[PDB]
Design an enzyme around this catalytic site. Structure first.
Site, PDB file in Angstrom:
ATOM      1  N   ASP A  62       0.789  -1.225   0.000  1.00  0.00           N
ATOM      2  CA  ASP A  62       0.000   0.000   0.000  1.00  0.00           C
ATOM      3  C   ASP A  62       0.833   1.292   0.000  1.00  0.00           C
ATOM      4  O   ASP A  62       0.565   2.213   0.770  1.00  0.00           O
ATOM      5  CB  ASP A  62      -0.942  -0.060   1.215  1.00  0.00           C
ATOM      6  CG  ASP A  62      -1.865   1.137   1.328  1.00  0.00           C
ATOM      7  OD1 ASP A  62      -2.406   1.598   0.304  1.00  0.00           O
ATOM      8  OD2 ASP A  62      -2.068   1.600   2.469  1.00  0.00           O
TER       9      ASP A  62
HETATM   10  C1  LIG Z   1      -9.108   1.330  -7.807  1.00  0.00           C
HETATM   11  O1  LIG Z   1      -8.671   0.227  -7.005  1.00  0.00           O
HETATM   12  C2  LIG Z   1      -8.764   0.459  -5.602  1.00  0.00           C
HETATM   13  O2  LIG Z   1      -7.807   1.440  -5.196  1.00  0.00           O
HETATM   14  C3  LIG Z   1      -7.884   1.790  -3.815  1.00  0.00           C
HETATM   15  C4  LIG Z   1      -6.882   2.907  -3.538  1.00  0.00           C
HETATM   16  O3  LIG Z   1      -7.423   4.153  -3.917  1.00  0.00           O
HETATM   17  C5  LIG Z   1      -7.561   0.559  -2.969  1.00  0.00           C
HETATM   18  O4  LIG Z   1      -7.763   0.884  -1.590  1.00  0.00           O
HETATM   19  C6  LIG Z   1      -6.708   0.451  -0.738  1.00  0.00           C
HETATM   20  O5  LIG Z   1      -6.772  -0.956  -0.534  1.00  0.00           O
HETATM   21  C7  LIG Z   1      -5.673  -1.477   0.214  1.00  0.00           C
HETATM   22  C8  LIG Z   1      -5.798  -2.991   0.265  1.00  0.00           C
HETATM   23  O6  LIG Z   1      -6.003  -3.492  -1.037  1.00  0.00           O
HETATM   24  C9  LIG Z   1      -5.673  -0.881   1.629  1.00  0.00           C
HETATM   25  S1  LIG Z   1      -4.218  -1.490   2.521  1.00  0.00           S
HETATM   26  C10 LIG Z   1      -4.820  -1.551   4.233  1.00  0.00           C
HETATM   27  O7  LIG Z   1      -3.827  -1.090   5.168  1.00  0.00           O
HETATM   28  C11 LIG Z   1      -2.883  -2.071   5.643  1.00  0.00           C
HETATM   29  C12 LIG Z   1      -2.089  -2.686   4.488  1.00  0.00           C
HETATM   30  O8  LIG Z   1      -1.412  -1.678   3.763  1.00  0.00           O
HETATM   31  C13 LIG Z   1      -3.591  -3.149   6.467  1.00  0.00           C
HETATM   32  O9  LIG Z   1      -3.505  -2.824   7.858  1.00  0.00           O
HETATM   33  C14 LIG Z   1      -2.335  -3.305   8.516  1.00  0.00           C
HETATM   34  O10 LIG Z   1      -2.385  -4.725   8.687  1.00  0.00           O
HETATM   35  C15 LIG Z   1      -1.182  -5.278   9.248  1.00  0.00           C
HETATM   36  C16 LIG Z   1      -1.329  -6.794   9.329  1.00  0.00           C
HETATM   37  O11 LIG Z   1      -2.589  -7.137   9.864  1.00  0.00           O
HETATM   38  C17 LIG Z   1      -0.940  -4.686  10.644  1.00  0.00           C
HETATM   39  O12 LIG Z   1       0.328  -5.100  11.102  1.00  0.00           O
HETATM   40  C18 LIG Z   1      -0.995  -3.151  10.628  1.00  0.00           C
HETATM   41  O13 LIG Z   1      -1.025  -2.668  11.955  1.00  0.00           O
HETATM   42  C19 LIG Z   1      -2.228  -2.647   9.885  1.00  0.00           C
HETATM   43  O14 LIG Z   1      -2.156  -1.242   9.746  1.00  0.00           O
HETATM   44  C20 LIG Z   1      -5.069  -3.278   6.102  1.00  0.00           C
HETATM   45  O15 LIG Z   1      -5.510  -4.587   6.391  1.00  0.00           O
HETATM   46  C21 LIG Z   1      -5.361  -2.935   4.635  1.00  0.00           C
HETATM   47  O16 LIG Z   1      -6.757  -2.982   4.417  1.00  0.00           O
HETATM   48  C22 LIG Z   1      -5.700   0.658   1.546  1.00  0.00           C
HETATM   49  O17 LIG Z   1      -5.891   1.204   2.840  1.00  0.00           O
HETATM   50  C23 LIG Z   1      -6.822   1.139   0.616  1.00  0.00           C
HETATM   51  O18 LIG Z   1      -6.759   2.539   0.454  1.00  0.00           O
HETATM   52  C24 LIG Z   1      -8.460  -0.631  -3.339  1.00  0.00           C
HETATM   53  O19 LIG Z   1      -7.956  -1.799  -2.729  1.00  0.00           O
HETATM   54  C25 LIG Z   1      -8.519  -0.851  -4.855  1.00  0.00           C
HETATM   55  O20 LIG Z   1      -9.550  -1.770  -5.144  1.00  0.00           O
END
Ligand SMILES: CO[C@@H]1O[C@H](CO)[C@@H](O[C@@H]2O[C@H](CO)[C@@H](S[C@@H]3O[C@H](CO)[C@@H](O[C@@H]4O[C@H](CO)[C@@H](O)[C@H](O)[C@H]4O)[C@H](O)[C@H]3O)[C@H](O)[C@H]2O)[C@H](O)[C@H]1O
Ligand SMILES: *[C@@H]1O[C@H](CO)[C@@H](O)[C@H](O)[C@H]1NC(C)=O
Ligand SMILES: *[C@@H]1O[C@H](CO)[C@@H](O)[C@H](O)[C@H]1NC(C)=O
Ligand SMILES: *[C@H]1O[C@H](CO)[C@@H](O)[C@H](O)[C@@H]1O
Ligand SMILES: *[C@H]1O[C@H](CO)[C@@H](O)[C@H](O)[C@@H]1O
Ligand SMILES: *[C@H]1O[C@H](CO)[C@@H](O)[C@H](O)[C@@H]1O
Ligand SMILES: *[C@H]1O[C@H](CO)[C@@H](O)[C@H](O)[C@@H]1O
Ligand SMILES: *[C@H]1O[C@H](CO)[C@@H](O)[C@H](O)[C@@H]1O
Ligand SMILES: *[C@H]1O[C@H](CO)[C@@H](O)[C@H](O)[C@@H]1O
Ligand SMILES: *[C@H]1O[C@H](CO)[C@@H](O)[C@H](O)[C@@H]1O
EC number: 3.2.1.91
Length: 362
Positions: free
Chosen positions: A136
């Site tokens: 991300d």
């Molecule tokens: C057009 O396609 C879409 O684009 C958007 C962006 O504009 C995408 O949105 C993004 O999706 C991402 C996942 O696909 C998430 S990542 C999110 O944050 C972190 C990973 O980077 C995770 O949290 C962390 O998890 C760790 C392990 O459990 C922990 O150690 C840590 O403490 C946590 O912070 C979390 O699980 C993820 O969900 C973006 O936030 C999001 O903007 C979209 O996917 C596309 O479809």
């Protein structure tokens, strides 16, 4: 520790005690019978340990120490970790903002963070270490420059990531740079710009031998090879991760990055289609399940291995509108609620993943 070809071959991914603890002490006590037994098995499936804070680094060494002891006992285990502490982290969202900010010496702090990690990897040169570099991050620079936080974090992201891949370029290491997923960069229009960016990172880091390739679908839910396009993927020919890596791979070669391979997260891809009402809905998606178990026998020329990067059960973000880091995506009707802070244990979600797992644990 050193390797040739697929870094997942010849070794066995280690299931860490951190996730094992979460399942055994936070999940199992609430389950009984068959479910309790199935949950115990989940804790034995290897998943990646996230170094989401500097406070997690001592844990990385503990894990490697455990692995060293196990390999002494005939073990042939490899460590799996996620480098994830960029300043102004998760620039396009709000749920996973990190401890470092570019404004407050974030780049310097990140480099310090990387130094701490390298010293541990150097001490444990005898352990094959598989790493996912900053999920991300770069993906946001391709589609989210319209977001101020991302626009202003561009140079820091590139500087930090270059430091990470150059400093961790060691013979016992295999790094996979995060590359979003099929529904993000997989769209034909985002393919080339994405390939150029990744290739420029690779070349700018002097083509690190340890940078084996890219990681996809990290913390997401796309199917690896589903044969029928889910309704929410309407318009995108690249509707699964296989199609995605096979599409971008050749483009990487065109831009200077040849022999790049991939690993894909399937930890929450077991149920297809998912409960997503919109493909862009990423937070605690309902109707998901544990998916394809980690393995190097992918039967695909570009995939080094199926992996479980995001640990199923750990939350994607809080659904509490008044809590810090609240992201509206986590309050959507296709997001399971109530949900805790990102990373924190989410029992109901763990049970959903266990119930809908395929292969099944029950
Ligand atoms: C057009 O396609 C879409 O684009 C958007 C962006 O504009 C995408 O949105 C993004 O999706 C991402 C996942 O696909 C998430 S990542 C999110 O944050 C972190 C990973 O980077 C995770 O949290 C962390 O998890 C760790 C392990 O459990 C922990 O150690 C840590 O403490 C946590 O912070 C979390 O699980 C993820 O969900 C973006 O936030 C999001 O903007 C979209 O996917 C596309 O479809
Ligand atoms: C190349 O490395 C330098 C190191 O300072 C960094 O600032 C720059 O952003 C990197 N460029 C790319 C395209 O990654
Ligand atoms: C998808 O991959 C899995 C794991 O390799 C395999 O068992 C399954 O048969 C594949 N499905 C299709 C449609 O190729
Ligand atoms: C490091 O050393 C091992 C053992 O010789 C090799 O198998 C590997 O290819 C690398 O050279
Ligand atoms: C790593 O450990 C596993 C045990 O589950 C072996 O099957 C594998 O060959 C490697 O030694
Ligand atoms: C084992 O480790 C997990 C993760 O830190 C804890 O949640 C659990 O209470 C135990 O300490
Ligand atoms: C947590 O601990 C239990 C036993 O107490 C295991 O069954 C589980 O797999 C995990 O290691
Ligand atoms: C989960 O964590 C508890 C401590 O809170 C242990 O007692 C248990 O064995 C498991 O590691
Ligand atoms: C496990 O889940 C149960 C609910 O099924 C809780 O009561 C318990 O506190 C733990 O979270
Ligand atoms: C889950 O199932 C196992 C047997 O498969 C039992 O031994 C355990 O007590 C639990 O019921």
């Amino acid at each position: 520790a050193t390797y040739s070809g697929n870094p997942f071959v010849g070794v066995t991914p280690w299931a860490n005690a951190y996730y094992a603890s979460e399942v055994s002490s936070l999940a199992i006590p609430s389950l009984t019978g068959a479910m309790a037994t199935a949950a115990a098995a989940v804790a034995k499936v290897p998943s990646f340990m996230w170094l989401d804070t500097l406070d997690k680094t001592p844990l990385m060494e503990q894990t490697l120490a455990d692995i060293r002891t196990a390999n002494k006992n005939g073990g042939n285990y490899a460590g799996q970790f996620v480098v994830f502490d960029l300043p102004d982290r998760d620039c396009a969202a709000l749920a996973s903002n990190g401890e470092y900010s570019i404004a407050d010496g974030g780049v310097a702090k990140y480099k310090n963070y990387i130094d701490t990690i390298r010293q541990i990897v150097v001490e444990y040169s005898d352990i094959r270490t598989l790493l996912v570099i900053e999920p991300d991050s770069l993906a946001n620079l391709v589609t989210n420059l319209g977001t101020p936080k991302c626009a202003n974090a561009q140079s820091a992201y590139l500087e930090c990531i270059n430091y990470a891949v150059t400093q961790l370029n060691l013979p016992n290491v295999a790094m996979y740079l995060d590359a979003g997923h099929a529904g993000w960069l997989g769209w034909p229009a985002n393919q080339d710009p994405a390939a150029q960016l990744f290739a420029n990172v690779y070349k700018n880091a002097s083509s690190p031998r340890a940078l084996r390739g890219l990681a996809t679908n990290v913390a997401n839910y796309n199917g690896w090879n589903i044969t029928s396009p889910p309704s929410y993927t309407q318009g995108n020919a690249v509707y699964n991760e296989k199609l995605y890596i096979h599409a971008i791979g050749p483009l990487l070669a065109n831009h200077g990055w040849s022999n790049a391979f991939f690993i894909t997260d399937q930890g929450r891809s077991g149920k297809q289609p998912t409960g997503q009402q919109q493909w862009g809905d990423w937070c605690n998606v309902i109707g998901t399940g544990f998916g394809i178990r980690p393995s190097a026998n992918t039967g695909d020329s570009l995939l080094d291995s199926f992996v479980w990067v995001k640990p199923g059960g750990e939350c994607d973000g809080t659904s509490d509108s008044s809590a810090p880091r609240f992201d509206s995506h986590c309050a959507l009707p296709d997001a399971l609620q109530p949900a805790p802070q990102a990373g924190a244990w989410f029992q109901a979600y763990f049970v959903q993943l266990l119930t809908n797992a395929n292969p099944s644990f029950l």
